[PDB]
Amino acid sequence: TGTLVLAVFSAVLGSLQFGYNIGVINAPQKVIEQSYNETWLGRQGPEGPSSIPPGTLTTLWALSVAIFSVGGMISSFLIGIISQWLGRKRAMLVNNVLAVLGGSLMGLANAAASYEMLILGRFLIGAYSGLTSGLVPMYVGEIAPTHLRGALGTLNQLAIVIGILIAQVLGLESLLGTASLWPLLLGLTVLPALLQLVLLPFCPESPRYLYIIQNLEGPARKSLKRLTGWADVSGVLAELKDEKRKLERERPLSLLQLLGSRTHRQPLIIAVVLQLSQQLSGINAVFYYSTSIFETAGVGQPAYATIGAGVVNTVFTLVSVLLVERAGRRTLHLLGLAGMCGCAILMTVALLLLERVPAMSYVSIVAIFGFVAFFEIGPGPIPWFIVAELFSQGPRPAAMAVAGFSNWTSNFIIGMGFQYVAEAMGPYVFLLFAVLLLGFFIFTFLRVPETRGRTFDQISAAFH
Ligand SMILES: C=C1[C@@H](C)[C@H]2[C@H](Cc3ccccc3)NC(=O)[C@]23OC(=O)/C=C\[C@H](O)CCC[C@@H](C)C/C=C/[C@H]3[C@@H]1O
Ligand SMILES: *[C@@H]1O[C@H](CO)[C@@H](O[C@@H]2O[C@H](CO)[C@@H](O)[C@H](O)[C@H]2NC(C)=O)[C@H](O)[C@H]1NC(C)=O
């Protein structure tokens, strides 16, 4: 099993970088912004009014995050062609080259006295994150033996949340996240990638790609032998043959082909809306700007509350992994949406009443965890389960891509928008989220079927 654990470790490193890049931006905000101010003057010089105008600074920061999201969008398109063209191991190695480039670009920003470098590096690391999110679950699913798929599936989510937590604690004022060393955080994401790059070459090649696509059996047999370790792997390749037959009897549809098939619409729309509900809920607000929200809410020390949100996210990630096994899909999503809406109407009230009762900050504090809590129960994992079980074997891949694209695009909006909205609306920002959640809830409650313990067969009938 040694090769198995090593390969799963490499995949987990990929997911860990992905999570770290998701969450590293939150803590150093009030330091990176001051650095931006510093460079923008260094540039202007004699005319400078002794301060970067707030509009430009807000725009640059919102760009610094929305560009991660844009790299994700661009990543959603390619996830397929390269996977079939180069494979999985080679794909992760090249994609790690991209990761190293992006991390170096982000790290060398301040020394270069320019912030365009940081934004470009964030674009590169967004492409990294999208590619690894696409390629890691696939690889672990290929290598995973017949009966450990369920155990390893939750690893791709445990790793992401743990990475968010690590980046969330590695940004304290005393820790790396200070004026002189902040680039180290944005540079730390170079180190694990290098490690992966120096570990993967020893790791095996996913048998399914090797046999199904490149139609070599001998190397597939060798990879299987070094993966599971049995003397003979006749049974697993015999099983591979039947799914080869199934794939050749159902050629996956093309993206424009899939969008052009009237039969697949009602499923498709469902998927897309779910992703919006997962994204336009407003969780990425809590993942990116939670330090600023807490500081606005009057919290005593926003950074500690930020790590608190991270740890609650992790705890209820594990709880959801325990739950989804024995609860359902539709019910979990409705519960999560309803919980997030009331929790955000609490937070709105807490902000609105902060002046009158100073202790309300604690309320706000707890509210956010509740928010995060509920997100990890219903809409965190579930939309992906619904999408996966909604579509047949053939048209699943293309559909996935579209969902991913939507999941990224919505993200961009929130990632790019929140700050402006935060300034325009006031305390009521989360109230907007509540309305959106309420909307989605109603739609879900009356439109999405129940996929757990159901045949694609019946589901199709349910849509009819
Ligand atoms: C808040 C977010 C972060 C925190 C995660 C969040 C938690 C999660 C992670 C992993 C699986 C299921 C749920 N729920 C997510 O959906 C999450 O992560 C992913 O989707 C990651 C990989 C997927 O297997 C393929 C899609 C990967 C991308 C196409 C979409 C990524 C979504 C992010 C999301 O931005
Ligand atoms: C941007 O940089 C300038 C200069 O470093 C900051 O100006 C200092 O700001 C503090 C607090 O506002 C004042 O007490 C100092 O007198 C200012 N020094 C100078 C030389 O002007 C400015 O505040 C910064 N603004 C932002 C938004 O970062």
Side-chain angles (χ1 to χ4, degrees):
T1 51
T3 71
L4 201 43
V5 295
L6 182 73
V8 185
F9 184 21
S10 306
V12 165
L13 281 163
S15 306
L16 191 43
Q17 305 213 105
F18 174 20
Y20 184 110
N21 304 297
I22 278 174
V24 65
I25 288 284
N26 184 326
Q29 173 184 300
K30 204 162 161 263
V31 185
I32 278 164
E33 271 186 29
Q34 213 294 340
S35 186
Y36 284 162
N37 164 17
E38 181 36 60
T39 81
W40 171 108
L41 309 135
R43 264 171 210 201
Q44 303 334 320
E47 172 36 49
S50 76
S51 166
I52 178 174
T56 51
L57 181 43
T58 291
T59 291
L60 291 183
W61 191 228
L63 201 43
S64 286
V65 305
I67 288 284
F68 184 61
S69 176
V70 165
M73 281 166 28
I74 308 314
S75 84
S76 86
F77 274 111
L78 311 173
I79 288 184
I81 48 184
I82 58 184
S83 196
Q84 293 134 30
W85 191 338
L86 321 183
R88 274 61 161 181
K89 264 192 51 193
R90 224 181 191 161
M92 271 156 298
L93 271 43
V94 175
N95 165 17
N96 274 117
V97 165
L98 191 73
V100 175
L101 171 53
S104 166
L105 272 193
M106 271 155 88
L108 292 193
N110 164 7
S114 86
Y115 43 70
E116 291 96 30
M117 281 205 48
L118 202 173
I119 308 164
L120 171 53
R122 274 291 290 210
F123 174 100
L124 281 293
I125 208 74
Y128 183 51
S129 286
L131 271 293
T132 182
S133 76
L135 281 183
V136 165
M138 171 175 328
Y139 184 41
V140 305
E142 301 326 320
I143 77 165
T146 181
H147 52 57
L148 321 173
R149 264 71 71 90
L152 271 43
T154 181
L155 212 53
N156 204 77
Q157 183 203 140
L158 271 193
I160 298 174
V161 185
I162 278 164
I164 278 174
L165 172 43
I166 278 174
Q168 273 213 39
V169 75
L170 261 183
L172 261 63
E173 181 266 300
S174 86
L175 271 193
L176 282 183
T178 191
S180 306
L181 311 93
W182 50 278
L184 277 296
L185 311 93
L186 321 173
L188 271 193
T189 181
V190 165
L191 281 153
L194 281 173
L195 171 53
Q196 153 174 20
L197 202 163
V198 75
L199 281 193
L200 261 173
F202 284 150
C203 274
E205 172 36 70
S206 86
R208 175 201 271 161
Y209 153 80
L210 202 173
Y211 184 90
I212 298 314
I213 298 314
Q214 293 323 110
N215 84 317
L216 311 93
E217 71 96 20
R221 184 211 271 291
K222 184 102 171 203
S223 166
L224 291 163
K225 284 182 131 153
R226 284 191 331 111
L227 271 163
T228 181
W230 310 328
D232 213 328
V233 305
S234 46
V236 305
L237 71 83
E239 192 295 328
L240 291 193
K241 284 202 291 153
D242 73 78
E243 81 205 90
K244 165 33 161 163
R245 274 311 191 81
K246 294 332 291 163
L247 171 143
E248 61 185 40
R249 284 311 71 201
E250 291 216 350
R251 204 271 171 181
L253 301 203
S254 196
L255 172 43
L256 72 83
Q257 183 54 0
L258 182 163
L259 271 53
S261 46
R262 174 51 171 191
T263 311
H264 273 77
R265 304 291 221 271
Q266 273 64 240
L268 201 43
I269 297 84
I270 288 294
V272 175
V273 185
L274 261 53
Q275 303 294 0
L276 271 53
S277 76
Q278 153 164 350
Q279 273 314 340
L280 261 53
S281 46
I283 208 64
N284 284 127
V286 165
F287 284 170
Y288 294 132
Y289 314 80
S290 166
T291 301
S292 46
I293 298 145
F294 284 148
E295 201 206 349
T296 291
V299 185
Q301 303 274 350
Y304 303 122
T306 292
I307 308 105
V311 75
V312 165
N313 194 337
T314 311
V315 165
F316 284 10
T317 291
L318 271 163
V319 165
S320 86
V321 175
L322 291 193
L323 211 63
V324 75
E325 211 166 310
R326 324 181 201 80
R329 314 261 171 290
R330 194 181 81 121
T331 301
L332 291 183
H333 203 207
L334 311 183
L335 162 53
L337 291 193
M340 281 206 268
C341 128
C343 269
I345 303 194
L346 166 72
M347 181 95 178
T348 291
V349 185
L351 301 183
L352 281 153
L353 202 43
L354 191 43
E355 201 86 0
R356 274 271 301 161
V357 165
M360 291 305 278
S361 46
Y362 313 120
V363 165
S364 76
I365 298 174
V366 55
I368 288 284
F369 313 80
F371 194 112
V372 175
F374 274 118
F375 164 98
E376 271 306 331
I377 288 184
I382 298 294
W384 290 118
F385 284 100
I386 278 174
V387 175
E389 271 156 340
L390 261 173
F391 284 101
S392 196
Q393 153 194 350
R396 214 161 41 181
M400 291 325 288
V402 165
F405 164 100
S406 46
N407 194 327
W408 280 118
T409 301
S410 46
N411 184 307
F412 164 92
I413 278 174
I414 208 64
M416 181 65 178
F418 174 90
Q419 313 204 90
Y420 313 110
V421 185
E423 182 216 339
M425 291 195 38
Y428 314 81
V429 185
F430 304 98
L431 202 163
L432 171 43
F433 284 130
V435 175
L436 281 173
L437 291 193
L438 161 53
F440 293 130
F441 163 90
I442 298 154
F443 164 80
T444 302
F445 173 100
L446 71 83
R447 204 81 81 191
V448 55
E450 41 276 31
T451 81
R452 174 171 191 271
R454 194 81 41 171
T455 60
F456 170 59
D457 331 341
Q458 294 157 77
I459 275 190
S460 190
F463 283 150
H464 273 77

Tab-separated table of all heavy atoms in Angstrom, residues 264 267 389-393 454-461 463:
chain	number	residue	atom	x	y	z
A	264	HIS	N	-31.537	17.562	-22.069
A	264	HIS	CA	-30.702	17.722	-20.889
A	264	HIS	C	-30.912	19.048	-20.173
A	264	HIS	O	-30.259	19.289	-19.154
A	264	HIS	CB	-29.230	17.595	-21.280
A	264	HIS	CG	-28.729	16.188	-21.271
A	264	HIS	ND1	-29.021	15.291	-22.276
A	264	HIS	CD2	-27.970	15.517	-20.376
A	264	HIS	CE1	-28.455	14.129	-22.003
A	264	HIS	NE2	-27.814	14.239	-20.855
A	267	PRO	N	-32.291	19.099	-16.169
A	267	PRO	CA	-31.153	18.796	-15.292
A	267	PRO	C	-30.142	19.922	-15.252
A	267	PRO	O	-29.847	20.451	-14.173
A	267	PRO	CB	-30.567	17.521	-15.906
A	267	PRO	CG	-31.681	16.909	-16.662
A	267	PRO	CD	-32.532	18.032	-17.153
A	389	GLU	N	-24.993	12.732	-9.436
A	389	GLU	CA	-26.030	11.716	-9.547
A	389	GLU	C	-27.156	12.116	-10.488
A	389	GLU	O	-27.995	11.272	-10.820
A	389	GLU	CB	-26.608	11.408	-8.162
A	389	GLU	CG	-25.858	10.310	-7.416
A	389	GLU	CD	-26.013	10.399	-5.908
A	389	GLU	OE1	-26.363	11.484	-5.399
A	389	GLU	OE2	-25.785	9.376	-5.230
A	390	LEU	N	-27.194	13.375	-10.924
A	390	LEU	CA	-28.256	13.822	-11.819
A	390	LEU	C	-28.036	13.319	-13.239
A	390	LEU	O	-28.996	12.968	-13.936
A	390	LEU	CB	-28.330	15.347	-11.809
A	390	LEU	CG	-29.390	15.993	-10.923
A	390	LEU	CD1	-29.210	17.495	-10.901
A	390	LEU	CD2	-30.775	15.641	-11.406
A	391	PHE	N	-26.785	13.281	-13.686
A	391	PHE	CA	-26.447	13.017	-15.075
A	391	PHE	C	-25.956	11.588	-15.254
A	391	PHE	O	-25.327	11.011	-14.365
A	391	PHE	CB	-25.367	13.983	-15.553
A	391	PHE	CG	-25.875	15.355	-15.839
A	391	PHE	CD1	-25.698	16.370	-14.921
A	391	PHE	CD2	-26.524	15.635	-17.023
A	391	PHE	CE1	-26.159	17.633	-15.180
A	391	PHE	CE2	-26.987	16.898	-17.284
A	391	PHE	CZ	-26.805	17.899	-16.363
A	392	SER	N	-26.232	11.028	-16.427
A	392	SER	CA	-25.794	9.679	-16.729
A	392	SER	C	-24.278	9.651	-16.905
A	392	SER	O	-23.583	10.653	-16.726
A	392	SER	CB	-26.500	9.160	-17.978
A	392	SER	OG	-26.371	7.753	-18.079
A	393	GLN	N	-23.758	8.472	-17.248
A	393	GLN	CA	-22.315	8.315	-17.404
A	393	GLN	C	-21.787	9.192	-18.533
A	393	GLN	O	-20.753	9.855	-18.389
A	393	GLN	CB	-21.982	6.842	-17.656
A	393	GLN	CG	-20.699	6.571	-18.448
A	393	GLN	CD	-20.614	5.138	-18.936
A	393	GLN	OE1	-21.407	4.286	-18.537
A	393	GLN	NE2	-19.648	4.865	-19.805
A	454	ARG	N	-31.645	6.581	-5.416
A	454	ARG	CA	-32.545	6.665	-6.553
A	454	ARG	C	-31.779	6.293	-7.814
A	454	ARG	O	-30.591	6.595	-7.947
A	454	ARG	CB	-33.140	8.072	-6.688
A	454	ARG	CG	-34.334	8.152	-7.630
A	454	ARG	CD	-35.641	7.709	-6.978
A	454	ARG	NE	-35.793	8.180	-5.603
A	454	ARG	CZ	-36.916	8.073	-4.900
A	454	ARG	NH1	-37.990	7.507	-5.434
A	454	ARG	NH2	-36.963	8.530	-3.657
A	455	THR	N	-32.455	5.699	-8.785
A	455	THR	CA	-31.825	5.300	-10.059
A	455	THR	C	-31.838	6.476	-11.011
A	455	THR	O	-32.774	7.274	-10.943
A	455	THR	CB	-32.586	4.156	-10.719
A	455	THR	OG1	-33.912	4.618	-10.952
A	455	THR	CG2	-32.610	2.903	-9.875
A	456	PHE	N	-30.825	6.618	-11.844
A	456	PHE	CA	-30.898	7.658	-12.880
A	456	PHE	C	-32.225	7.399	-13.552
A	456	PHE	O	-32.879	8.336	-13.989
A	456	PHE	CB	-29.853	7.564	-13.978
A	456	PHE	CG	-30.157	8.511	-15.104
A	456	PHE	CD1	-30.241	9.870	-14.863
A	456	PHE	CD2	-30.432	8.042	-16.372
A	456	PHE	CE1	-30.548	10.749	-15.885
A	456	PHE	CE2	-30.736	8.923	-17.396
A	456	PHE	CZ	-30.793	10.274	-17.151
A	457	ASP	N	-32.608	6.135	-13.624
A	457	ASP	CA	-33.854	5.776	-14.334
A	457	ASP	C	-34.974	6.617	-13.751
A	457	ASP	O	-35.449	7.530	-14.420
A	457	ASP	CB	-34.187	4.290	-14.212
A	457	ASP	CG	-32.982	3.381	-14.058
A	457	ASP	OD1	-31.867	3.818	-14.399
A	457	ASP	OD2	-33.171	2.250	-13.583
A	458	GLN	N	-35.333	6.344	-12.517
A	458	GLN	CA	-36.454	7.036	-11.879
A	458	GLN	C	-36.205	8.524	-12.017
A	458	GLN	O	-37.125	9.201	-12.427
A	458	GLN	CB	-36.560	6.634	-10.413
A	458	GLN	CG	-36.937	5.180	-10.205
A	458	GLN	CD	-36.511	4.688	-8.845
A	458	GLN	OE1	-37.141	4.986	-7.834
A	458	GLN	NE2	-35.434	3.924	-8.808
A	459	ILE	N	-35.005	9.018	-11.728
A	459	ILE	CA	-34.825	10.498	-11.696
A	459	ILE	C	-35.378	11.038	-13.013
A	459	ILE	O	-36.236	11.901	-12.953
A	459	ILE	CB	-33.377	10.914	-11.400
A	459	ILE	CG1	-33.108	10.960	-9.897
A	459	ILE	CG2	-33.064	12.235	-12.074
A	459	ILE	CD1	-31.789	11.586	-9.527
A	460	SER	N	-34.919	10.499	-14.146
A	460	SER	CA	-35.385	10.909	-15.495
A	460	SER	C	-36.914	10.994	-15.502
A	460	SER	O	-37.436	12.023	-15.974
A	460	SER	CB	-34.882	9.959	-16.547
A	460	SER	OG	-35.131	10.467	-17.849
A	461	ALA	N	-37.609	9.968	-14.996
A	461	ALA	CA	-39.065	9.993	-14.927
A	461	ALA	C	-39.555	11.144	-14.061
A	461	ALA	O	-40.537	11.809	-14.409
A	461	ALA	CB	-39.589	8.664	-14.384
A	463	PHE	N	-38.240	14.008	-13.665
A	463	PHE	CA	-38.157	15.214	-14.481
A	463	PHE	C	-39.260	15.265	-15.529
A	463	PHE	O	-39.475	16.308	-16.154
A	463	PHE	CB	-36.789	15.308	-15.160
A	463	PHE	CG	-35.682	15.750	-14.249
A	463	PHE	CD1	-34.388	15.317	-14.461
A	463	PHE	CD2	-35.931	16.590	-13.179
A	463	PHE	CE1	-33.371	15.718	-13.628
A	463	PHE	CE2	-34.918	16.996	-12.352
A	463	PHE	CZ	-33.638	16.559	-12.571
